[PDB]
Amino acid sequence: MNESQIMQETIPFLHLRKKDEFGNW
Amino acid sequence: VRTFSQQEMAFNLLGLMAPAIVNLCQSDPVFADLNGGLQFIPDLKGLM
Numbered sequence A: 001m002n003e004s005q006i007m008q009e010t011i012p013f014l015h016l017r018k019k020d021e022f023g024n025w
Numbered sequence B: 001v002r003t004f005s006q007q008e009m010a011f012n013l014l015g016l017m018a019p020a021i022v023n024l025c026q027s028d029p030v031f032a033d034l035n036g037g038l039q040f041i042p043d044l045k046g047l048m
Helices: A003-007 B006-017 B019-025
Strands: none
Touching: B006 B019
């Protein structure tokens, strides 16, 4: 819900995503 | 969760019309979730 307050390695150049409960990829 | 009467949602809108917010826009676009927090009801389609 608020990632910015709580938190104040590598991702591939070709990936698939999936949908968050809050419709996020 | 909240649903709005017309009169309410108009009030809400005129809110972003207020001098305060206007100046925010003049520098940076504004997003305004004026949804009654229904974002948290998943499968709302189904609920209704």
